[PDB]
């Protein structure tokens, strides 16, 4: 079913909360043992967001592999994504850990530091050109090399240098800034422009590692990021585009990361950008 009348008969009936309900019971429950170990209680932002054990990104040091972070593997779309937390005070050295030995090439950022007067992430990279950052738990420096701000988001170059080695690699921030604090935004159309800046930087393509996507739980605004990007990929891919059902395609992320969409607003957002973008990758 065309999901674009799919929309227009649930927005008529007033169904949102009823649909995003099915999902909830029908989504995948696996174990999360890992996360739940009391020596790791410091490096999880809320009780109840946790990555599955099958699914988790396991940190190269023997001492405590763990981090809040999910290898979201979509066979039939060939991309991966990291989905992630908003890092802590104590897990900012992990982040960049993480991002080194996966190889990724791009951090994809949807909240503000701080956001309805509390703070939602760290401040984990750097502001000032000639103020760098160290992490010497893991033995990272971090330097800023350029910003380009826009009225919707922010493009940051980044330095991120392993100090065991003297390798170095350039790293691309893409921040999402206009995200507002209640609710989801009334247009997809900035949303979808973004998505399509991070495409064409090369950040999300096979000869990189997986992006790295967080906001601050790293299920809600990340899910829609990435719910997004696979199903605009399918309907490219296949020869009936029409047969792509964003229903499916949510309860299969869902199988790597619990949570992803966290409101009915979202599921609904959602689709409204896969319609309106659908409306560029299939020729207009």
């Known amino acids: 079913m065309e999901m674009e009348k799919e929309f227009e008969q649930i927005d008529k009936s007033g169904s949102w909360a009823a649909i995003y309900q099915d999902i909830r019971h029908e989504a ?16 999880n932002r809320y009780r ?7 699914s ?15 290898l979201i593997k979509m066979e039939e779309a060939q991309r991966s994504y990291i989905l992630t937390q908003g890092p802590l005070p104590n897990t900012v050295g992990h982040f960049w850990e993480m991002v080194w030995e996966q190889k990724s090439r791009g951090v994809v950022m949807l909240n503000r530091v701080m956001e309805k007067g509390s703070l939602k992430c760290a401040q984990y990279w750097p ?5 760098e950052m160290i992490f010497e738990d893991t033995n990272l420096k971090l330097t800023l090399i350029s910003e380009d701000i826009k009225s919707y988001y922010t493009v940051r170059q980044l330095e991120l240098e392993n100090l065991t080695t003297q390798e170095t690699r350039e ?6 800034t206009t995200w507002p604090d209640f609710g989801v935004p009334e247009s997809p159309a900035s949303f979808l422009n973004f998505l399509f800046k991070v495409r064409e930087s090369g950040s999300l393509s096979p000869e990189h590692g997986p992006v790295v996507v967080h906001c601050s739980a790293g299920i809600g605004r990340s899910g829609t990021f990435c719910l997004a990007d696979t199903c605009l990929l399918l309907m490219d891919k296949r020869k009936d585009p029409s047969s792509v059902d964003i229903k499916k395609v949510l309860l299969e992320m869902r199988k790597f990361r619990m949570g992803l969409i966290q409101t009915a607003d979202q599921l609904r957002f959602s689709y409204l950008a896969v319609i309106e973008g659908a409306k560029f990758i299939m020729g207009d």
């Open 48 to 54: 109840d967001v946790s990555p599955f054990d099958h």
């Open 127 to 131: 502001q000032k050109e000639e103020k």
């Open 171 to 176: 790293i691309l921030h893409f921040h999402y």
């Open 28 to 43: 995948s429950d696996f174990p999360s043992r890992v996360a739940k170990l009391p020596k790791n209680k410091n490096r």
């Open 56 to 70: 988790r990104i396991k940190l190269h040091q023997e001492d405590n592999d763990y981090i809040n972070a999910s």
